[model samples]
Target: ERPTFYRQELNKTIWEVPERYQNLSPVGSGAYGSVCAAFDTKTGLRVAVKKLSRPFQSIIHAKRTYRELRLLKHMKHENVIGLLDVFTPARSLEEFNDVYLVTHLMGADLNNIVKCQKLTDDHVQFLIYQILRGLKYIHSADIIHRDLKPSNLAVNEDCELKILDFGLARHTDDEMTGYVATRWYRAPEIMLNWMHYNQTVDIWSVGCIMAELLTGRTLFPGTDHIDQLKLILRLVGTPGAELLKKISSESARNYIQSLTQMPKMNFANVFIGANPLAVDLLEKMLVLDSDKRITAAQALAHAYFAQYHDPDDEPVADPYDQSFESRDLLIDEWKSLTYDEVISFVPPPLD
Candidate 1:
């Protein structure tokens, strides 16, 4: 019989299995849930286990869970986090309220690295290349990673980078609201409520992340949604009348027009001591018009990454045997789907 255990700090149930894993320690916490660093007894590997907090608390949470699980199962790339395992302590489907995801442990997130480490130009180039490579693979699959930020990106001492946190990811054709992405890294089109947007929104975020890495601080540390737009306008300067016309929100367009036309800051002055090529790449990505923003593929080939780019390098093909697609799910339907997914999953053979 499986011994029962409940973690007071997490307020959730867990299975007693010292033989499989041990020495779990809390690593971090976020809106999604708390994560713990644990040693996998079977594989003799370190893993990060996330105990999803109140997954079924609301319909939105349940839907997000379903999408995240589906995407993680299918997305296999060198620059993307791999899902090692998933489990639930609940004995029956009725009791299955929490979901735990197991992933490879990384040394630290980019947010911490930016705050602590003195990143060189070489480090910046390599990190941004890896990010673009990962984004290329994701965009090829018609997925938009709505949320891209420093904290959401994981890195290792080897300078390896991996993109994580797909809870906010959605397909290109999916109807999405503007309330996605961290305010600081959000695109102007999203902040102004453009009628429709695409993967370019992620390109804007990459620009913000790159700028943050170069300056060792947030490029646009806006306090609120409105303030975020204001900060962006100050740095990038106000958009032209043609770009403002793209805004579907009449009030947003008028407000932008009413604002003082600030001149764009010199890239050299902003990213002090940065290479001209790097600033040029940043300029391409941080364009006021989403239509003009550089695509991930374009970014990968930019002069900034010229030394690192290899013509022969190709994105890894989808490794999963099954095809996964996103769909709307009711609360009960999502629960049943997630439960079945957990029970049926067999850890893939290690490479």
Candidate 2:
């Protein structure tokens, strides 16, 4: 169960969309949402705006969106994306059935950089460090960002990293209710249908992201959801019969059976000449049992980050390539809004 407000606020304050912002340019799109680049009309600041499309119109969508707002509102760290304001449209999209969420538009996300083949080891280190920091904060707050992936991780023009898109995030300590996160980034325990999980889920995701950054490819790229589990087993070795017994889902057993014949391989041999610290972290993060997996706090304290991190210089350069003219247009627009004006509008009852 979660908190219920008398009414869902929709109207955005002037501060939410400052006086100076105008002209949004589309940057990225996916299954659940799309992102745009916009300029502030007042201070000449540039930001990204993300809007979600309503397909089936379910409670999960509302929960994910609201949970993101709730989590971000309480969290303040250099590595997490900032929630500038909540943008709910004036009239429900009765005809089109669309809902919008306005947040600080960030530059290229971690997925974009990795796909473009621009990430380096140092960049991976910096990204992993910040990712763990953000996850630590989320875990400490007693919230779990079930969906952790490269696509959800963003970096601004300043090389500052932030975790975005909380539609799949839910409080894990409560009764298990929502299915969250991308399949590839999900832990093996999750893939095996284990209902009891915690912050270790995000740590496993961080490990996958680390390997992808280093190799310029996804760690576990699968053809289908079940195959994803097979890919993990291939890399990490098959789980024991006792471990298999824990998984009651028939689909889970099928996935494990698919990889039963494959030979187990060592981590260093798989990524020849890869960073040892990275491999060390990946092994712990990708443990067969969720209970054995490293916690977000533990990953942050791992010696790999401390020993390999360069104290003298910043790790990676900012990956965003937006121009000043575009930035100025957005900042000017942001100066006109206030928080009060924004929360007054109501969101339609999520069915």
Best by lDDT: 1
Candidate 1 is scored at a TM of 0.84
For model 1, residues 122-228, the per-residue Cα lDDT tens digits are 99999999999988888877777777878778898787888987436423333334444356777878755764888898999999888888877777776666777
The C-alpha lDDT values of all candidates are 0.75, 0.60
Candidate 2 structure, TM-score to reference: 0.68
The residue-level lDDT of candidate 1 at 183 comes to: 66
**Total clashes for model 1:** 0
TM-score of each: 0.84, 0.68
Per-model root-mean-square deviation over C-alphas: 4.6, 12.2
Please report how far candidate 1 places residue 151 from its true position, in Å. 0.9
Clash counts for all predictions: 0, 47
For the record, the alpha-carbon RMSD of candidate 1 to the native fold, in angstroms, is: 4.6
How large an RMSD does model 2 have?
Answer: 12.2
